[PDB]
Design a protein around this nucleic acid. Structure first.
Ligand SMILES: Nc1ncnc2c1ncn2[C@@H]1O[C@H](COP(=O)(O)OP(=O)(O)OP(=O)(O)O)[C@@H](O)[C@H]1O
Ligand SMILES: Nc1ncnc2c1ncn2[C@@H]1O[C@H](COP(=O)(O)OP(=O)(O)OP(=O)(O)O)[C@@H](O)[C@H]1O
Ligand SMILES: Nc1ncnc2c1ncn2[C@@H]1O[C@H](COP(=O)(O)OP(=O)(O)OP(=O)(O)O)[C@@H](O)[C@H]1O
Ligand SMILES: [Mg+2]
Ligand SMILES: [Mg+2]
Ligand SMILES: [Mg+2]
Lengths: 316, 316, 316
DNA sequence: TTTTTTTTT
C-alpha cells in the first residue's frame, strides 16, 4: 500500500513530512483518518498547512459512496486464518478473519495463550492451509511468551523452527501507557512488509492495575476505548487481524442465570464488549478437553465446539 | 544490572535522585516500568522533571521490538532450580523456573511449607546441581519458619549449616498492608547482589483476615492484584523466581466433578489463578507418600508425580 | 516486654493513649501489628493521629530483614513444656513448644481435657523440669474444670496445692461471641507478668451451636478464622503457648481409607487445620492405655506413642 | 464497572 511519500509530490514541502512521520503518520490512509484537531497538535504544523495536507491526501484517494458490490469485492481479500482445530475453524467460517478484532476469554489453564502461540505458527503457511506468509507482532502483558513452545509446535508442522522464530516480533508492555505507545510505534513497521496478525495477550492486564479504585473508572474506560479504536483502525487499513486474550471474574451478585458456572462475565465493561468483533468463551470440559463457545460474531450465528490442547497446539 | 545512578549523569540533578530512591525506585528498569501518574505522586517531583527523567532513562536502554530470537537468547539465562525430587523436577522441566511465579497449594500436612524449606537449601548450590549461589528472601505469614530444619536438611546436603543460614533473609509479615510494604523494601536489596528466590508462605493468609465480610471483597481482590503485579515485576527485572504457598477450601456446592476430593479449589478467586504462572496441587497419598499434580504451566502439558517428605526435605 | 506507655514520650498526647488502651491495645507490638483501617475504628482517633502513632511505634522497634541467625537466636527462648509422659514429650521434642498452637483431638474419654489439667500443673515448675514459673489462663467451653483434680495431680508432684491453685485463672466462655471477647481482655493481663500457657478446652464447642444450618457456614468459618489469628498473634508476641482441645465426627461418606476407625476427622474444616501448628490424635487403645499420634508438626516427622491416664495425670 | 466464600453427620 502507498506511504506518506506519494503525497510529497502534490505541492507539499518535504519539511514537516518528516514532522508528520515523527507524529506517528506513516501512510496516507492514516492521514485521511486523522482529525484536523489532532493533526494541529503535532507541535509545528500550521492549520492552513494541515488543510493543504488534507487536500493533497484527498487528491490521491477518495472516500465517497461505493454502491455495495465494489465493497463485496474489496472484502474479497479478507484473508481468513486457521486456528488449529478444524472443528473451531469451521465454527468461525475459516478461523480468525483479518481486518477485525477477535477476543477470546476464559478461566485459567483454558487453552488461551496456547491458541496465540499456535496462531503465531499457523500464519507462516501457504494461503491454501489457512494463513499466508505473514509476519506476526506479539505484545505480551504478563510474560509467558515461550519461544520454545513456538519451535516445538512448528516442528509439528514440519516448518523450520528458526525460520518461524525469525518472523515473530516480541514486545513486553510494562504498563498501560507503555502498551499504548507500543501500537503507535507499530503503525510504522506495519506500513512496510507483510504483517498478518497482531496479538495482545491479556489486553486489560495493565489497565486493571493502573486505574484502580472506582472513582477512577471513567478514565480507565476512556483510555481503553482510545486504545481499541486505534487497534481497529490499524486492523482495517493494513488488512491485518487483531487477536486479544481477556480474563474473567466472579459475579457475587446472585445465582439465577443459571446460578452456576461463574467462570464467565469477562472484565472490561461494555466498552470492550462493543468494540470486539468476535467473542469466544473457553471453558474447561472433562479430562483434558475444553469447550469453545462463540458468543458474538457478525458472520455466524452461534455454536459449541470441543478441542484438545496437545503438543502441536490446539487440536482435536 | 545497572542502578538508578547511571542516569545521574544525563543532565539529571542529584537532588531528587535521593527522592526517587526514597520512593522505592532503585534501578533503571523500575523507572522505565513506572507510570508517570505514579511517578508524579512521590511528593516533590515535577511533571516536566518526570519527563526529563523518563527521557534520560529511555536513553540508557530501549524497549522496542526484538524480532524473536534475541528473545530466545535473553531467555537463555532463565536459570531453573531443583525442587528436591528428580521425579517432580523432571515433571517441571528442571524445577522452579526463574523470573516467574509458581504457586503450590493443598490441604494441611502436605509439607508445602516444607518444599519451601528445602528450596531455601537447594539454592546455594553450584548451577550444575539445580540452583546457583543465590541468596534467599523468606516472607512468612504464619510463623512456622524453623532455622533448625534448614540446618538439618543442609547437613543432608553436606553444606555447612552456618553458611546456608547466613544466606537467608527472614521477614515476618504481620498484616497484609505490612506484607505489601515488605516487597517495596525488598526492591532495594534485590538491586545489589545475588538473590535467586523469593518465598511467600501462604500469600493470602493475611488478606483472608483483613478484608472479611463480602461487600468488602472487591477491595481485597484489588489489593491482592496490585501485590501480585509488583511481585511479577520484581521476578522479571531481577531474574529471580517467586514461590507462593496457598491454601484450600471446601466446596459445599455439590458432588458432581467428581463428587469427592474436596481438598481442592484453592482460595484467591481468579485474580490469583490468572497471575500465577505455574500451579501445583499437593495431595495426601498413602502411608507417608504424597501426590503432586501440575495443573497450570506454560511450558509442560500436565502430569502426576509421587514424592516423600523425609529428613532431607522433599525426596522420593 | 515494653508496654504502650514507652511511646507516651515520643510527641504523643496522653489523651487517647487511654483511648487506645481501651480499644484493646496494651503493648507496642500489638500496635505495630494492628492495621490502620482497624486503628481508625476505635471511635475517637484521627487518621493523622493514627499515622503519628504508627511512626512513634516504628521509632521504638523496627521490623526489617533479620538475616537468619538473629532469628535462630531470638528463637532460642522458645521455652518448651513437658506434657507428663516422657514418651510423648520425646515424641514432640520436649513437649508443648511456646509461641505456637497445638491442637489435640479424639473421641470421648480419650484423654484430652485431662492433659490440659496436667499441663496446668506441669507449668509452675523450674525450667529444668519441662516448664517454668508461668501462670496459666484456662478458658473452658464445656464446664468440666475441676480444681480438685488440679490439687490432686499437684500433690503427686509434691507442689503445694494452694500455691498452684493460686496461679491459674479460670474463665467460663458462655457463647462464641463471649469467647472471642475473652481473648481481647486477655491481651491486657498477658501484658504484665509471667503467663506461660493458654488453654482453650473445646475451642469449637460454642461455634458448633451458634452458627448451625449450612447456608450459615461461611460466617462461622470467618469468625473462627479471626479468632485463631488473634490467638496466634498473642502466642507470638508474649512468648506463650496455646493448647486447644478439639472434637471428632463420624464420616458417613464411605469405608475405604481404611474403612474403619471412624473416631477421626476432627471438626472445624480446613480453616482450623491450617492455622494449627501441631496436631495430635488421641485414640483409645487397650485396657486403660491410650495411643497418641502426631499428624501435623513443623519440627518432627511423625510417630506413635502410648500413655496411661492415672492419678498423677498423663503418665506411662 | 468491580469482585468469591465456606463443611456436616
Ligand atoms: N523434621 C521434621 N519435623 C517436622 N515434621 C516433619 C519433619 N520431617 C517430615 N515431617 C512431616 O512432613 C509433613 C510436613 O507438613 P508441612 O510442613 O508441609 O505442613 P504445611 O502444609 O506447610 O502447613 P499446613 O499444612 O498447616 O498449612 C508433616 O506431616 C511433618 O510431620
Ligand atoms: N508444551 C506444553 N507446555 C506447558 N503446558 C502445556 C503444553 N502443552 C499443553 N499444555 C497445557 O495446556 C494448558 C495451557 O494453559 P494456557 O497456556 O492456556 O494458560 P492461559 O489461560 O494462557 O493463562 P492463564 O490461564 O494463567 O490466564 C495448560 O494446562 C498446560 O499445562
Ligand atoms: N481422678 C480422676 N477422676 C476422673 N476420671 C479419671 C481420673 N483419673 C483418670 N480418670 C479417667 O481418665 C479419663 C479422662 O477422660 P477425659 O477427661 O480425657 O475426657 P475428655 O476427652 O476430656 O472429655 P470428652 O471425652 O467428654 O470430650 C476418663 O476415663 C476418666 O474416668
Ligand atoms: Mg495465559
Ligand atoms: Mg504450613
Ligand atoms: Mg472433655
Amino acid at each position: 500500500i502507498l506511504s506518506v511519500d506519494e503525497l510529497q509530490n502534490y505541492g507539499i514541502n518535504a519539511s514537516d513530512l518528516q514532522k508528520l512521520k515523527s507524529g506517528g503518520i506513516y501512510t496516507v490512509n492514516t492521514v485521511l483518518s486523522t482529525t484536523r484537531r489532532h493533526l494541529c497538535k503535532i507541535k509545528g504544523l500550521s492549520e492552513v498547512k494541515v488543510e493543504k495536507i488534507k487536500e493533497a491526501a484527498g487528491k490521491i484517494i477518495q472516500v465517497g459512496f461505493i454502491p455495495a458490490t465494489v465493497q463485496l469485492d474489496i472484502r474479497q481479500r479478507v484473508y481468513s486464518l486457521s486456528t488449529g482445530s478444524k472443528q473451531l475453524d469451521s465454527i468461525l467460517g475459516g478461523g480468525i478473519m483479518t481486518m477485525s478484532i477477535t477476543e477470546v476469554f476464559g478461566e485459567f489453564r483454558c487453552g488461551k495463550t496456547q491458541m496465540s502461540h499456535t496462531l503465531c505458527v499457523t500464519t507462516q503457511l501457504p494461503r491454501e492451509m489457512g494463513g499466508g506468509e505473514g509476519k506476526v507482532a506479539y505484545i505480551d502483558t504478563e510474560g509467558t511468551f515461550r519461544p520454545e513452545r513456538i519451535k516445538q509446535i512448528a516442528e509439528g508442522y514440519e516448518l523450520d523452527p528458526e525460520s518461524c522464530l525469525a518472523n515473530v516480533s516480541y514486545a513486553r508492555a510494562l504498563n498501560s501507557e507503555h502498551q499504548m505507545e507500543l501500537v503507535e510505534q507499530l503503525g510504522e513497521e506495519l506500513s512496510s512488509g507483510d504483517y498478518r496478525l497482531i496479538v495482545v495477550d491479556s489486553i486489560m492486564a495493565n489497565f486493571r492495575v493502573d486505574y484502580c479504585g472506582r472513582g477512577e473508572l471513567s478514565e480507565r474506560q476512556q483510555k481503553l476505548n482510545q486504545h481499541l479504536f486505534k487497534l481497529n483502525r490499524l486492523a482495517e487499513e493494513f488488512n491485518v487481524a487483531v487477536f486479544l486474550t481477556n480474563q474473567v471474574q466472579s459475579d457475587p451478585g446472585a445465582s439465577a442465570l443459571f446460578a452456576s458456572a461463574d467462570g464467565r462475565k469477562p472484565i472490561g465493561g461494555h466498552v470492550l464488549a462493543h468494540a470486539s468483533a468476535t467473542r469466544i468463551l473457553l471453558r474447561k470440559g472433562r479430562g483434558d478437553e475444553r469447550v469453545a463457545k462463540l458468543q458474538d460474531s457478525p458472520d455466524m450465528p452461534e455454536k459449541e465446539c470441543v478441542y484438545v490442547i496437545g503438543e502441536k497446539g490446539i487440536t482435536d
